[PDB]
Every structure is written in structure tokens, then in C-alpha cells.
Design a protein around this ligand. Structure first.
Ligand SMILES: CC(C)(COP(=O)(O)OP(=O)(O)OC[C@H]1O[C@@H](n2cnc3c(N)ncnc32)[C@H](O)[C@@H]1OP(=O)(O)O)[C@@H](O)C(=O)NCCC(=O)NCCS
Ligand SMILES: CC(C)(COP(=O)(O)OP(=O)(O)OC[C@H]1O[C@@H](n2cnc3c(N)ncnc32)[C@H](O)[C@@H]1OP(=O)(O)O)[C@@H](O)C(=O)NCCC(=O)NCCS
Ligand SMILES: O=C([O-])CC(=O)C(=O)O
Ligand SMILES: O=C([O-])CC(=O)C(=O)O
Lengths: 434, 434
């Protein structure tokens, strides 16, 4: 009905059987080869893990359990008075493989609202943190400290049956998702709103709304952006560092709290979670260098400079995707309707016309189109979320959705300890010579 | 000379060139195949990554840059008045590939002693933590909060050259290793010594000694055990979850602090870091069930019960190793000389005679010999380290050695973002049908 845990109880045995069958038939089917470059090249191209919740076609971008962003935009339930998809509904999709109903979504909003309370020790911890401790550091430490609340960790050590793992994981994952906005907003307020309180969860507001309230914003459209934001950042295959980290750490039977916090430390990495910031920085430098308002051909010549000087035009390209990110388009649409005359956006809008035209000519590229990160920055800034250091906190709150959805399934399906084999260069050399 | 950073400056270009050469020749050499079972089976058997510091021959156990535990026991410098190898020397080995000199070791002791101070905010954090927050949770959160001290994170965001990455990483790794005992001991004292202070670093004592002092022990032989302990837990290939996690998170250019803390959350997992505890628990239950003193044939029959009832005799077997763990033998030797009449040990000693004899007959096994975890427990208990929840803190303090040694080399060699490809079951099915 509306009880997700019950629907999950239904789905799991079917998937387990489907998997076991496939492994009996095709377990020894070679699905690719491992080269020396793949070992040195951070496993690039190597099919390495099964992750069920989302799949990225390098052609049309990301699909959540079969559905594209555009479909999600239309099918997923919206806020009462909204036109953006509730991330609750997206969680539901990743977990069940089914588009939810308004009732299902509403039920999930209430569930998360019921579970959202922080333990005192985590409030103390956040409240005592200095202002120079990075937001993501605060987040990761806080979530680690939450592991005191873990069902799974307690029950595991009592000797619960493997079959029951997923159930504990679900409860913890549900608890964690509920608390994350609280954590995230306590960080925001401690850092930028002089330690004021987050205030109260409204039991009748959606997750994204209770969030933006706790962050101390009130503008309708910032809450709609957030809804979009949290939806579209939620998942991106299992190969990305935050996903994979979560998966790897979970594989050792570390609870969702420890699994998520590990993931956040990977999300904190410049090469994964910071591109938003780097775009916004680069743009600000662009406007400083050749001016805030510009003709297309002027804009064009600046581009080449960045390149030939040994610098990446940021927000463009991707490790695997090979076309304009649905997650960009998504945001563009949001900005063709809600701030078409915002100047930073106009510039974002302009680079979409010029950057692609060049870049390919530079050769070194593969992916000549914008990624999600090219666009998120100006939207956040526009509503007064100007604190760039904080922006990955948003991303993480979102990415909890996908990686916890998967973590449940990973435990449900009994995936084992991730434990690839390493080789030293020397050993790898003595291997190939043989 | 004694300045490790200088020797590292020397070694790196040589290794870079050796690697580049090998990649030019053999980059496309297939070194194995990926099956469907490897994707579902947590990458088991799949050569996936290059990790230089240690290699595990499934036959003779672990080698540190070419040397076995027995060699390390003889070659590595010892404390002045010691017979156990200083883990400083082991760090030196993993970093340089060279057995160090007493002078090199002494220099490293002094370096770590100089860098050991904790920032106030981390002391506040530890000092405010409740007693029910797991030691490993405390550790991981503390190390995350240390990232405020990161050289690498600050310099990265200023736009330092890739070539300089390793240098920053080395400084951070050196700082972190130095602070870890302080963190670890502050946790120990807060939890078990009523919040007493850790006291002072002696600038003329080795790392292991300054540790056991801060932990509030004084017995010579506990400090010698610790020296052995920290040495032999230090590294175990890059495939183990803590190593790999560190490697994965580092690959995103997260600083050593974030990389290590992520690793600790994986080490916290029952399937990686808890076997020590599970052994000690199982043993205590064994003595409760059939008595504290026992004949060999009695002991023998109990074993079968554990098995046939659907339970693992813990401390025996390993994901990859296939013989008596050097890390066990190591400890046995330490207990054939320092507590041969300790009863818990006698029992450990007795199971080494009976368990192997059976187990294989159970079939399900592959690895019928003891791992390191079968032995560490009774040694720690013997000197009054009876707090089992804390034992993984020790393991982590040790494992920092190997995974930071590697993290330096990973940055030195310019290893890229780890980013394997995932597939859903459904996608994997539509792949094989094609
Ligand atoms: C995302 C990104 C890292 C993917 O690159 P990759 O998969 O590692 O590598 P590529 O296949 O693009 O490498 C081909 C070349 O194109 C370059 N390149 C890729 N995108 C580029 C861009 N937008 N501007 C300039 N050069 C670019 C790479 O630096 C590389 O140059 P090289 O051959 O001299 O090393 C890259 O597009 C980039 O740096 N973009 C900016 C950062 C960003 O937007 N990140 C967010 C996604 S996580
Ligand atoms: C370490 C360990 C997990 C490795 O097992 P693995 O590589 O996952 O799997 P194996 O190749 O041993 O699996 C073969 C069978 O032997 C069993 N097995 C392995 N060691 C065993 C032991 N000491 N006692 C009983 N059964 C054992 C496994 O449970 C498995 O049974 P199954 O076929 O019914 O599933 C396993 O030896 C174990 O559980 N030991 C105790 C825990 C421990 O000491 N861990 C520390 C190392 S991280
Ligand atoms: O997919 C990637 O590697 C890029 C990304 O950060 C994500 O969306 O998670
Ligand atoms: O090698 C493994 O997987 C077991 C272990 O925990 C280690 O020593 O790190």
C-alpha cells in the first residue's frame, strides 16, 4: 500500500531469484577484459560492480530505474502548488522501480518528518565546531557520530540473520535521510546565521520544504529549485566515487551512517564534488577579465585562452557521459522561466552557445557539452545561497537518496565484501612476463 | 640522508619513468577477464588496482616491499632495549622500498613527536563525545575534523601544480600519523580512564612508546607488543576494504585526513575490522560451554558443533591468503616467550593443533589455517587492554602506516580518479544477450 517496507518485502525475493538464475546461467560469461591501463587508470571502462538504482547511457544521460529526467519531471509527484518533482518520489522510484502515487509520496514525507530528530551529542558537536572547519567535514563527522543511532550495528552484533539485514538497513537509511537536512541546516546556520536554531519540522511539509525552512529561506521558487536540485543530484550509477565508496564501505557491513559518511569524504574531493564551485569561480574570474556583458565573438576568444594556457573550461565534459547533461537542461529550463534576465545566467546561457562550438577543435575532450555542474551554481547564488563552500553539502543531502536506495538492495541481495585484487607495478610486470 | 622527503624526491622520477615505459609497451596487455560472478561477487579475484607498498602471496603471506614478516623482524630497527621492530622503520620501508637505518628511524620518531599536537577543536570534540559512541566512530569523526589542518586541501584550492601534489600529501600524512596516537589515546582515556589527560609526547621516545604512555600503560612488554602489533597490521595489499577505500577516496583528491577517515569507516565494518573481537568473544563462550581447561579430544568435538550448527570458527581462513598467517606466527612467537602459561593463550595454542586438522573435512573452507585475528585478542587482554570495542582503533592506527605510504605514491605517480563502470542486473542481462 503506502508502507514502502512492505512493498520492498514483496520485491526482494523476486529479484533474488532473477539474480540467482542469471548467475547460474551466465556467471562465467566474460563481460569485458582487464588491461594494464585499466589497473593504472583508476579502473576506467572496467565493468566492476552491480548497482541497480540508476544507469547512465553515455548517450542520453542518466536514467532512474528506466526513466529519464524529462519523464521524471512529468511522472513524479509534485508539491501541492509545485511544478518540480518531489525527491521523496524519486527515492520511491529508486527503491521500488515504480513511479509512486501522491499518497505514497505524502506517506514518505510524513515518515521522514517523524524521524528527523537529532541526538544531543550531534547538536553539541555541530554547535562546538569552529567556522573554519569545512561544511563537508562537519557533515561527514556528524553523520559518523550519528552511528550511535544505528539499528543495523546493534542488531548485527547480537547475531541477527542475514535475511533480516535489509530491514535494519532500510530503517537506518530512512532515519538518516530524515536527519540529513537537520544536520545540513544546523551546519548552514552555525556558519552563516550566527548559530541561530533550525526550528521545527513541519509534519505536513515535504522534505525539501522543511529543509529550506531550516536553512532560513522562505522564497517559493528556492524551495522549488531545491526540489529539482535534490531530485536530479540523487544518483549517477555506482561507479562515481561517492556511490562506490558507499557501496565498498557498506560491503563490509558498516551501517548506512558509516557508509554515507565515507561517501561524503569522497564527495568532498575536488575531482568529484567541487566542480559547482569551480564553475562559479571561473565565471566570476571571466567577468572580471573581459567584463560582465559581452558579445558572442569576444566571449569566443576568451575561451581559447583558457585552453591554450593549459586550463579546463569547467562544467563541460564528463568521465563517461557524451552529450548535454539532462541535469543541465533541467536547470536551464528552470532558468528560462524563473530568471531569464539574471546576468550570470545570461552568461551561462551564452557559453552554452560558444563553448561547444570550440572545445572539440581543441581535440582533447571526448565530451564537448555541459554537465550538471555548469548550471547549478548561478541558480543557488540567485536565491541568496552564495556560500560556495556549502554547495557540496546540498549535493550530499541529495546523493544520500540514490546510495541509500542502493545500499538497501545490496544488503537485500546479499552482495559480499568488495575485495578486488591488487598488484604492485613490479608484480604486475612479473605477471605479464609469464 | 635522514630526510625522507628528500629520498622520496629522488625515487619518484625513477618510478614514474618505469611505469610510463611499462604502460607504453603493455598498456593493452589483458591481465585477466571480468565475469558476471565477479561483478556480483564483490570483484573477487579481479585484478583492479595498482598498490605498491605490500603484496600478498596467497602462499607465504604478506610481503612489505619484497620482505616477509620474519625478515622484517630481523632487519627492521628495534627500540633501544627492544627486540620488536619499530613501526617507524616499517613506514620507511613501505615508502622507500629500502630497509632504513637506526638513524633514519630515530629521525622519523623525532619528526612524528614534533608534529603530534592536536588542535583545540578536536580535543573539544573528543572531550564532549558520550561513552556510548563507538571508539571507531570517535576516531573517524576526529580525523575528519582534523582536515582543517590539511596542507593539501588548502594548496589544491589555490591552484598548485600536480607535480607538487605528493609533497603536500606527504606532509599531511606525516602530520596525521603523528596525531593518530594522540587521538586514539584521548578516546581511550575519555572512555576507560574517566577523561584523564594523555599527557606529554616524549621527543626522545618512539611512536609506539609515546602511544602506550598516552594510553596509560607502563609495562615494557606491552610497549613491545604494541611495536609488533603496529608493524604487522600496517598494510595488506590494496584490495582490503580499508586500503581500497583510502585509495578510492584519495583518487578524488580528498586529503589524507578525509581519505583515512573514510578508510576507518570501512575498517569499522564487521567483515573487516571486528574479527579480533569476534574471536575473543567466541573463545570466552567456548570456555563457558565446555570449560576453561580441556583435553585435546574434548576440544575437538566442540569444534564440529560450531560448524554443523552453521557457525564459523573465527580467526581461521581469509579472503585470499591460503596458509598460516605470518601475522599469527609472529604473535605466537611473542606468546611462546612472554606468556606461555597464560591460559587463554594455551587455548589459542591448542586450537592451532585441532582446528586445522578438522575444518578441511568440513569442505567449505579453502583456507584452513589461522589469520592474524585469531591471536591478537589474548595478547591485548593479557596486558590489561580488555576493552574489545577499542581494539579496531589499534588496527586503524597501524593501517594508517600502509595506506598513507601508498597515498603518497598514488599522488606521486599521478593515479587518476577511480571510476569503474557499473551495470544494473537488467542492463547486465541485456549486455550478455548481445
Ligand atoms: C569532467 C572531466 C574531468 C572529464 O575528463 P576525463 O574523462 O578525465 O578526460 P577526457 O576524456 O576529457 O580527456 C581528454 C582531454 O580533454 C580535456 N578536457 C575535457 N573537458 C575539457 C574542458 N571542458 N575544457 C578543456 N579541456 C577539457 C582533458 O583535460 C583532457 O586533456 P589531456 O588529453 O591534455 O589530458 C573533464 O571534462 C573536466 O575537467 N571538466 C571540468 C570539471 C567538471 O566539470 N567536472 C564535473 C564532473 S565530475
Ligand atoms: C575470513 C573468511 C571470511 C574468508 O571466507 P571467504 O573467503 O568469504 O569464503 P570461503 O572461501 O572460506 O568460503 C568457503 C566456505 O568456508 C567457510 N569457512 C571459511 N572459514 C571458515 C572457518 N574458519 N570456520 C568455518 N567455516 C569457514 C565459509 O563460511 C564458506 O562456507 P559456505 O560455502 O557455506 O558459504 C572466513 O575464513 C571466515 O569467516 N573466518 C572468520 C572471520 C575472520 O577470521 N575474519 C578475519 C579476516 S578479514
Ligand atoms: O558521475 C560522475 O562521476 C560525476 C558525478 O559527480 C556524479 O554525478 O555523481
Ligand atoms: O586483507 C584482508 O582483507 C584482511 C584484513 O583485514 C587486512 O589485513 O587488512
Amino acid at each position: 500500500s503506502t508502507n514502502l517496507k512492505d512493498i520492498l518485502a514483496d520485491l526482494i525475493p523476486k529479484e533474488q531469484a532473477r539474480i540467482k538464475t542469471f548467475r547460474q546461467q551466465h556467471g562465467k560469461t566474460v563481460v569485458g577484459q582487464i588491461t594494464v591501463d585499466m589497473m593504472y587508470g583508476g579502473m576506467r571502462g572496467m565493468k566492476g560492480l552491480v548497482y541497480e538504482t540508476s544507469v547512465l547511457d553515455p548517450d542520453e544521460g542518466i536514467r532512474f530505474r528506466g526513466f529519464s529526467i524529462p519523464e521524471c519531471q512529468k511522472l513524479l509527484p509534485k508539491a501541492k502548488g509545485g511544478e518540480e518533482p518531489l525527491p521523496e518520489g524519486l527515492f520511491w522510484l529508486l527503491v521500488t522501480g515504480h513511479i509512486p502515487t501522491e499518497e505514497q509520496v505524502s506517506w514518505l514525507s510524513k515518515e521522514w518528518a517523524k524521524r528527523a530528530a537529532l541526538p544531543s551529542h550531534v547538536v553539541t558537536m555541530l554547535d562546538n565546531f569552529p567556522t573554519n572547519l569545512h561544511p563537508m567535514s562537519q557533515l561527514s563527522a556528524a553523520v559518523t557520530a550519528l552511528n550511535s543511532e544505528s539499528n543495523f550495528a546493534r542488531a548485527y552484533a547480537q547475531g541477527i540473520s542475514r535475511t533480516k539485514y535489509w530491514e535494519l538497513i532500510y530503517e537506518d537509511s530512512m532515519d538518516l535521510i530524515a536527519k540529513l537536512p537537520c544536520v545540513a541546516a544546523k551546519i548552514y546556520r552555525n556558519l552563516y546565521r550566527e548559530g541561530s536554531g533550525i526550528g521545527a519540522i513541519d509534519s505536513n511539509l515535504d522534505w525539501s520544504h522543511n529543509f529550506t525552512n531550516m536553512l532560513g529561506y522562505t522564497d517559493h521558487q528556492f524551495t522549488e529549485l531545491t526540489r529539482l536540485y535534490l531530485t536530479i543530484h540523487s544518483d549517477h550509477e555506482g561507479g562515481n566515487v561517492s556511490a562506490h565508496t558507499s557501496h565498498l564501505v557498506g560491503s563490509a557491513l558498516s551501517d548506512p551512517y558509516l557508509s554515507f559518511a565515507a561517501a561524503m569524504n569522497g564527495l568532498a574531493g575536488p575531482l568529484h564534488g567541487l566542480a559547482n564551485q569551480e564553475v562559479l569561480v571561473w565565471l566570476t574570474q571571466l567577468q572580471k577579465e573581459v567584463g560582465k556583458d559581452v558579445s558572442d565573438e569576444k566571449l569566443r576568444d576568451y575561451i581559447w585562452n583558457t585552453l591554450n594556457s593549459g586550463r579546463v573550461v569547467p562544467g563541460y565534459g564528463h568521465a563517461v557521459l557524451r552529450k548535454t547533461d539532462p541535469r543541465y537542461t533541467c536547470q536551464r529550463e528552470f532558468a528560462l522561466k524563473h530568471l531569464p534576465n539574471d546576468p550570470m545566467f545570461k552568461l551561462v546561457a551564452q557559453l552554452y552557445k560558444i563553448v561547444p562550438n570550440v572545445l572539440l577543435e581543441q581535440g582533447k575532450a571526448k565530451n564537448p557539452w555541459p554537465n550538471v555542474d555548469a548550471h547549478s551554481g548561478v541558480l543557488l547564488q540567485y536565491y541568496g545561497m552564495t556560500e560556495m563552500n556549502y554547495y557540496t553539502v546540498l549535493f550530499g543531502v541529495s546523493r544520500a537518496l540514490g546510495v541509500l536506495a542502493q545500499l538497501i538492495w545490496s544488503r537485500a541481495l546479499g552482495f559480499p565484501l568488495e575485495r578486488p585484487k591488487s598488484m604492485s607495478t613490479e608484480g604486475l610486470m612479473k605477471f605479464v612476463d609469464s
